[PDB]
Symmetry: D2
Subunit: 26 residues, 4 copies
Amino acid sequence: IEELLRKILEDDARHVAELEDIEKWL
Amino acid sequence: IEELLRKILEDDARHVAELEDIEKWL
Amino acid sequence: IEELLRKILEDDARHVAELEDIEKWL
Amino acid sequence: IEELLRKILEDDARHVAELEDIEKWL
Ligand SMILES: [Zn+2]
Ligand SMILES: [Zn+2]
Ligand SMILES: [Zn+2]
Ligand SMILES: [Zn+2]
Ligand SMILES: [Zn+2]
Ligand SMILES: [Zn+2]
């Protein structure tokens, strides 16, 4: 469970960065 | 941008799946 | 913990729907 | 679209925060 939660956390951190990039580009 | 959004949404679909399993294990 | 996980799951399901909408609109 | 993306990214920032606390409680 801890490893799966860590990876979801990782994904969401990355999603924040990606979405901020997309906001700039739009 | 469209491709990147697609990847992000595929991640969230996977997150639903993983969170649902984590609920079961907990 | 279960209630917090349920709400994250909810959010991600909604995010899938929202991102599919944004893909259509783009 | 830009406003909706902003809301989605704010959610993911909150998800990081919630997942981090869940890791601590677990
Ligand atoms: Zn995310
Ligand atoms: Zn997610
Ligand atoms: Zn499952
Ligand atoms: Zn999400
Ligand atoms: Zn999320
Ligand atoms: Zn915290």
